[PDB]
Amino acid sequence: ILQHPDGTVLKQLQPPPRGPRELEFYNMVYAADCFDGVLLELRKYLPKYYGIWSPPTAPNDLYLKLEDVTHKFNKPCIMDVKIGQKSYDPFASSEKIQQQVSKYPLMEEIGFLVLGMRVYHVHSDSYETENQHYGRSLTKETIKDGVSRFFHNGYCLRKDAVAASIQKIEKILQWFENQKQLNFYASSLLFVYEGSSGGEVEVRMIDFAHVFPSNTIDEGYVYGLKHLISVLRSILDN
Numbered sequence: 495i496l497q498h499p500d501g502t503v504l505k506q507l508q509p510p511p512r513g514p515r516e517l518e519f520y521n522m523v524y525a526a527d528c529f530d531g532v533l534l535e536l537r538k539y540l541p542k543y544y545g546i547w548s549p550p551t552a553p554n555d556l557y558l559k560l561e562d563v564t565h566k567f568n569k570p571c572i573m574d575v576k577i578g579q580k581s582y583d584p585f586a587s588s589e590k591i592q593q594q595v596s597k598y599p600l601m602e603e604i605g606f607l608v609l610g611m612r613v614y615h616v617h618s619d620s621y622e623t624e625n626q627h628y629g630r631s632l633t634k635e636t637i638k639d640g641v642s643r644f645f646h647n648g649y650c651l652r653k654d655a656v657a658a659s660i661q662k663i664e665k666i667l668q669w670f671e672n673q674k675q676l677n678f679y680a681s682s683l684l685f686v687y688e689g690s691s692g693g694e695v696e697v698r699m700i701d702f703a704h705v706f707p708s709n710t711i712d713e714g715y716v717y718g719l720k721h722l723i724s725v726l727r728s729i730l731d732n
């Protein structure tokens with residue numbers, strides 16, 4: 495992810511088949527001739543897509559030009575949360591399935607995984623960051639407090655951002671309950687709120703290298719969203 499001053503990011507295509515699949519996902523959803531109401535509605539929850547991009551001197555080097563959803567914030571607090579019960583896709587080998595389940599064996603149980611966070615602390619004018627090992631260390635016993643940390647600025651719990659996040663996620667949940675054409679594996683929600691205004695958050699769906707056509711509800715994704723909403727809801731009683 496390369497941040498560009500113009501308010502966009504350049505996401506480098508992942509190696510094949512993942513990069514190519516994410517490109518085709520964005521191209522499908524943002525097709526200029528698309529009249530699919532499910533897909534038109536989905537656009538509301540994704541970063542705006544500005545097409546494929548590569549450097550002038552390097553046609554080989556492929557990127558997705560996307561809206562930087564953090565650009566309108568002064569001190570953006572950012573959390574990446576993987577959603578679903580399975581983070582492997584329907585066509586993974588036994589070895590790949592095993593590797594993906596071992597990366598976080600509670601995925602089925604919890605339905606989501608914190609990939610990282612960057613939280614602005616008001617008193618020090620500084621950020622505290624957590625890497626992938628933070629969320630992977632969380633269990634049922636510690637997920638509520640694990641998620642809460644994102645919304646604590648060193649002085650208070652930002653319950654305004656927690657409540658706004660629930661409301662934004664609820665619209666995404668509604669979309670998932672009104673579609674049976676796509677299932678999403680190893681995809682995330684990107685949470686952003688203002689660290690420095692009240693109730694102002696972004697929640698956007700990202701990471702689409704394992705989105706597949708389907709005939710059914712994405713049950714794993716629904717479970718994950720529901721559980722995530724429940725955890726956030728409990729944090730409002732802190």
Ligand SMILES: COc1ccc(-c2cc(=O)c3c(O)cc(O)cc3o2)cc1O
Nearest residue numbers: 495503541560561562563564572700701
């Ligand atoms: C300084 O930290 C960040 C700043 C911006 C982002 C960011 C911002 C984005 O808008 C974004 C996106 O649209 C798609 C995507 O796959 C990833 C994205 O990441 C992520 C960050 O960790």
